[PDB]
Amino acid sequence: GADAKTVQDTVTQVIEQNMNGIDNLMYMSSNSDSTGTVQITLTFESGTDADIAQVQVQNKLQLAMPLLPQEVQQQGVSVEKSSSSFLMVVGVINTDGTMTQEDISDYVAANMKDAISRTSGVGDVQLFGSQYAMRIWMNPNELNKFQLTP
Amino acid sequence: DIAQVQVQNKLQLAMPLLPQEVQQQGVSVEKSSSSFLMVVGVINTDGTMTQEDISDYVAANMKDAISRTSGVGDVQLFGSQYAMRIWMNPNELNKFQLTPVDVITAIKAQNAQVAAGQLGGTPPVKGQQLNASIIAQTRLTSTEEFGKIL
Amino acid sequence: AVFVPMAFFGGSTGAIYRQFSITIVSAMALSVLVALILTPALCATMLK
Amino acid sequence: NAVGTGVMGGMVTATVLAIFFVPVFFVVVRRRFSRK
Amino acid sequence: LKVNQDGSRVLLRDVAKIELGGENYDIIAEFNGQPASGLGIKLATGANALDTAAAIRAELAKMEPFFPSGLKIVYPYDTTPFVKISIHEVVKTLVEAIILVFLVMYLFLQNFRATLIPTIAVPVVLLGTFAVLAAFGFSINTLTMFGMVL
Amino acid sequence: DTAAAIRAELAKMEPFFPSGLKIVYPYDTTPFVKISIHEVVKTLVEAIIL
Amino acid sequence: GMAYLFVRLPSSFLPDEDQGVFMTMVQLPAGATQERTQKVLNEVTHYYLTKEKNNVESVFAVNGFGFAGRGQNTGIAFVSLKDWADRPGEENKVEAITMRATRAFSQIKDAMVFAFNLPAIVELGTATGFDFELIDQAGLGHEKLTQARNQLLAEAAKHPMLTSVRPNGLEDTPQFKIDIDQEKAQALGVSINDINTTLGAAWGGSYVNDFIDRGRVKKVYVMSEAKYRMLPDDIGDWYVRAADGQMVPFSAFSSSRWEYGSPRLERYNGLPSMEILGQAAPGKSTGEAMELMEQLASKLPTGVGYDWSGNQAPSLYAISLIVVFLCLAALYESWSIPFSVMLVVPLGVIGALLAATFRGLTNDVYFQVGLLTTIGLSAKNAILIVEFAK
Amino acid sequence: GAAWGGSYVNDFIDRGRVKKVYVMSEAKYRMLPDDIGDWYVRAADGQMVP
């Protein structure tokens, strides 16, 4: 839910302040979206190990982890190796026993995505849609009709 | 490199066995040297400022950068960065019948940023033309606005 | 003397100019040792 | 095509020029002897 | 949720709709217009690339057999065949350039035995470069393959 | 190398300072490196001449 | 002539080529919907399906995922062309496929859709192109920085030996602000905690708990039907509990008024920045254009700083000029042979240049090492007309 | 703890950079041990307590 300004100085800034003291490092950029999703990239010197370079950055974020909204803490915080480029992009459809573009997004993410994102050092798997989740569509009229809130 | 990681990926296991004031306080794991080298003093001559105005501007411009650039072990700050300071009065609290617990709760309510979804939400109704993010409460800016906490 | 000097790569042109030079410089030393061991032998062994 | 067009071009003008006409012969003439 | 004065049981079904739907309805995938969902694997900074995408099918090979009715796989945007072809087009030239030098060797050296030494010389020199570049860390890169042929 | 890059990062902070805010350099290691090199390389040349 | 065949020969890094695979991104105007952008992706997917059957084998459209980032404005489509044997012409090659494609979208649409060969190179290093950045060094706001960005972009186009400059992706759409009067809240008897988590759970949803679903643990979310959170008049529908056991309208304590805040706030190197993707002039090249760009950012207001073949080569061949002469006296000691082979250098190179300048080739990495080999062979031939004759 | 030693309550914004918010007390009401009596606390029955 968080708008672009909220994430920019409640998750983004808090890390950026507590994102220092790392061996080899050119710069860091940031992107504080209105979807409520920040992503900070740090480019290092060429030839530097991606193994240790990752650990140093994520063993410093961890110090700013308790300085974060509690909704953000239980949300997905990830530190991985970037490549701004896909290679295998395996589409999955249905023909016979037909299912929606959500039934498939769930089954893909509840069978293969868990495995693929681990097998042979895969950097960052993308999911085209989303996994299922017990969804509830609250009604405001019915809540006041019984005297209630979310 | 690895000697640091092993020590701080073990502290992390005792992180939830710590006072909650300590958790949000600065927990750091870095490389020691019990010895400085460059110690760059910063003063003022023309547009004069105190030994606190300078400690803030040093820590809100350079310290964030220097402590990261070229694997700097541990930057020291001679003074401290600014912070919205409040000097409670005991006579005035009892004169209105109050405690510091009522003041702490007042800032943990009015001084905060909240996630307010968006018009044309994630799943909309097929037919909507608009999609814009909602704004909620804002983290206070000035000393004047911290004075008007009800 | 023209390959390996230029094989001192730099920047994003790292393994770019490097790999090309060394691949052919290794190939040159291997071609020379073959031209000092095999080609000489094979030739003496059986050319005519 | 980016490799070969560059090499092909040079090899035509490397030999057909060197072995014949232009230096690779005029050299030793005015390098070994010329003045010393 | 509640039980109003006259013991009338208020359930969460009465106040709102409840369906098992997407966790995130922001993105939606349409393979050739038809509804669908896939996986967009990106590389891990300093990964083996082709070796990774070969093991993408290894893990994904054992998911295939337990798919429900209709659930089939399809392959858009794929890197694999560009690797397979550039190897096959460069190794194609290697063999051409050998056959062609064998003709130039026969037209000058009418001796059939004499047009063999150079034809059997460079086969060994190339294999040496594969033994040398493996010993220095390099692989069969697009670059080191032109390095063979050049 | 670290303290040389301390000035590299700090070089681009200098230009956007407010009125009066200037830098000064106490307790510094840099010139002891610069001098011990220059005194040893000085001997190298002496010992050659001699 | 050799010099002139070499100075005027343009310098690219590495040639972009057909990969049997390209793509194309989407970008709708400010505050567009998932419904609006989905209409655009449909026209794009089908330009490939009906007017490109001989080329395209399979499309894979995606609504709400651009390579800028995310949002109901953005989009993309992953093309997967038919194999190279069934694509005979140069018209059937990615070069020409992304030519009439990019043209088609510009004509029969009202937003922005392009197309591009996937840089067979890396993301970075395009040649005759830059990535500028516009930092706010002082304590200026985001709105003051945006004005300096409109002044930098303005001056470049005011007098471009040109340039081609644009912003990165800060459209700056409006936002529905809600000011809650804290005074009214306490008077009617409502907690501020309750008011916030009603607005956050209703419009934006909320991660409440986890549950089990056929083995795998998934999430539990609570939000609201779309029809009670589409426009700003639906805020009044939500009533909150009050101390004195009764409901309270949102409008009671609420205030509604629109604003202008950006939907993405870039922050380059700990400070608020805005990215400026411009290319070098069609006449000039990178280093010329970048040098004629730092002088334009230095004409902006106070508290507004900035940050960004090979120059490598000049020194590379410099060591080639030394090791040659020393290896040319390691077996050819005289000071006659060390200068003999020094002439075959431009004998071969004049021709290498000439072939690349004739056809559409450029000075890329392949030609740069195809030049090294041209000099290597050149030495061989010449040294044979020396080692023998000596 | 909040009176004599202060307390990290929340964060706030100050010219871009997020900083801290602290609550303690003027020095003059926490210098010696006789100033402990100045602080009165709320009690269940809506009244202060020394």
CATH number for the domain spanning G83: value is: 3.30.70.1430
Which technique? Answer: X-ray
Residues 33-52 of A with CB under 8 A from B: 34, 36, 52
* Interface mutation vs chain C, best among E125, E143, E146, E149, most C CBs within 10 Å: E125
Q: Do G272 and H16 touch (CB under 8 A)?
A: yes
Q: Is there a contact between G320 and C20 if contact means CB atoms under 8 Å apart?
A: no
E77/G78 touch (CB, cutoff 8 Å), yes or no:
yes
The CA distance from G347 to A38, in Å, is 58
In residues, how long is chain H? 50
Distance, in Å, from the CA atom of E94 to the CA atom of E83, rounded to the nearest integer, reads: 17
Question: Cβ of F4: how many Cβ atoms within 10 Å?
Answer: 11
- Determine the distance from the C-alpha atom of residue E133 to the mean position of all C-alpha atoms in its chain, rounded to a whole number: 23
Which residues, in sequence order, are CB contacts of F22 under 8 Å at separation 6+?
Answer: B42, B43, B44, B45
A143 CA to chain B: closest CA distance, Å?
A: 19
Strand ranges for chain G from DSSP E: 22-27, 56-58, 61-63, 74-78, 80-81, 112-113, 116-117, 132-135, 164-167, 174-178, 207-213, 216-222, 239-242, 246-249, 256-260, 264-266, 273-279
Q: Give the whole-angstrom CA distance, residue F8 versus residue F30.
A: 14
Least CA distance to B125: which residue of chain G?
G226
Interface of D with G in 1-36 (CB under 8 A): 1-15, 17-19, 22-25, 27-28, 31-32
Q: CA G239, CA G234: separation in Å to the nearest integer?
A: 11
- Starting from the edge strand earliest in sequence, which strands make up the sheet with E16-22, in order? E16-22, A132-138, G216-222, G207-213
Q: Give yes or no: residues G147 and G91 share one domain.
A: no
Show the tokens assigned to B95: 């004169």
Contacts of G327 (CB under 8 A, 6+ apart): C1
Q: Which two tokens stand for residue E14?
A: 């009465």
Report how far apart, in Å, the C-alpha atoms of H6 and of each of A38, B92, B106 are.
32, 18, 16
Beta strands in G269-368 (DSSP E): 273-279
Beta-bridge partner residues of E8: E4
The C-alpha atoms of residue G254 and residue G179 are separated, in whole angstroms, by 6
Cβ–Cβ contact E136 with C under 8 A: yes
G122 and C CB contact within 8 Å: yes
CB contact under 8 A, E31 and G62: no
Q: Does E111 touch chain C (CB under 8 A)?
A: yes
Residue F42 DSSP class: H
Cα separation, B118 vs A34, whole angstroms? 9
Chain G residues touching residue B132 (CB < 8 angstroms) = 31, 173-176
Q: What is the resolution of this structure in A?
A: 3.7
**Dihedral sign from CA coordinates of C29, E91, G359, E103:** positive
CATH no. of B80-150: 3.30.2090.10
Which chain G residues have a beta carbon less than 8 Å from that of D10? 348-353, 355, 370-371, 374, 378
List subunits contacting chain E, requiring 3 or more Cβ pairs under 8 Å: A, B, C, D, G
d(CA H15, CA G145): 13
Dist. CA B111–CA H9, nearest whole Å: 10
First to last CA, chain C: 35
Q: Tokens 């194309």 appear where? A: G24
Contact A50, A81 (CB under 8 A): yes
Who among E111, E118, E129 is closest to C23 (CB)?
E129
Helix boundaries (H) for B12-142: 20-23, 53-59, 63-66, 90-95, 100-110
The nearest alpha carbon in chain G to H17 belongs to G271
Let me know: does G267 contact G135? Beta carbons within 8 Å: no
- Spacing of C-alpha G279 from chain mean position: 12
Residue whose structure tokens are 């490598």: G312
Q: Are residues G150 and G295 in the same domain?
A: yes
**A146: chain E residues, CB-CB within 8 Å:** 1-2, 4, 10, 14-15
Q: Closest Cα to residue C33, out of G216, E124, G387, G57?
A: E124
Residue G298 tokens, joined? 């230095």
Closest C-alpha to A1, from G120, G87, B137, B10: B137
SS3 G236: coil
Q: Do residue G69 and residue G218 come from a single domain?
A: no
Domain identity same for G165 and G279: yes
CB distance from G170 to chain H under 8 Å?
no
Please identify among residues 92-121 of chain G the ones whose CB lies closer than 8 Å to any CB of chain D. Answer: none
SS3 of chain E: the string is: CEEECCCEEECHHHHEEEEEEECCCCCEEEECCEEECCEEEEECCCCCCHHHHHHHHHHHHCCHHHCCCCEEEECCCCCHHHHHHHHHHHHHHHHHHHHHHHHHHHHHCCCCCCCCCCCCCHHHHHHHHHHHHHHCCCCCCHHHHHHHHC
To the nearest 10 degrees (0 to 180), the angle between helices G286-297 and G142-158 is 130
Residue ranges of alpha helices (H) inside chain B are: 2-11, 20-23, 53-59, 63-66, 90-95, 100-110, 143-147
CATH code for position G276: 3.30.70.1440
Cα radius of gyration (chain B)? 23
In degrees rounded to 5, what are phi and psi of residue E69?
A: -65, 120
Q: Which amino acid is it at G299?
A: K
The nearest alpha carbon in chain H to A11 belongs to: H18
- CATH for G257: 3.30.2090.10
G41 is written with which tokens?
């992706």
Q: How far is C6 from chain E (nearest CA, A)?
A: 15
- Residue type present at position G261: G
> Do G376 and C2 meet the contact criterion of CB atoms below 8 Å apart?
yes
- Which tokens in the block code for residue G112? 């922005």
Length of chain F measured in residues:
50
Tell me, yes or no, whether G181 and G302 share the same domain.
Answer: no
Helix, strand, coil shares of chain C, percent, nearest 5, are: 60, 5, 35
A11: nearest CA in chain B? B113
G114 plus G132 within the same structural domain:
no
Give me the total of CB pairs closer than 8 Å, taking one residue from chain D and one from chain E.
4
Phi first, then psi, for residue B80 (nearest 5°) are -160, 155
Token pair belonging to F8: 């590299």
CA distances from A81 to A30, A43, B66, E58 (A): 16, 11, 25, 22
- Find which of G267, G268, G269 to mutate to test the A interface (most A CBs within 10 Å of its CB): G267
Q: Among A27, A118, A39, which residue's Cα sits nearest to residue A82? A: A39
CB-count burial class (<10 Å; 0-12, 13-18, 19+) for E84: exposed
Rounded to 10 degrees, the C-alpha dihedral A118/A120/A122/A128 comes to -70
Residue pointed to by tokens 């906490």 = B149
User: What domain range includes position G292?
Assistant: 124-172+270-309
First to last CA, chain A: 16
Are F and B touching by the rule of 3+ CB pairs within 8 Å? yes
Distance CA G384, CA D24 (A): 9
Probe site for chain A from B74, B114, B119, B122 (most A CB atoms < 10 A): B114
In CATH, A1-82 is 3.30.420.40:
no
E-C interface (Cβ pairs under 8 Å ≥ 3)? yes
Residue of B nearest to A18 (CA): B64
Cβ distance G218 to A138 less than 8 Å, yes or no, reads: no
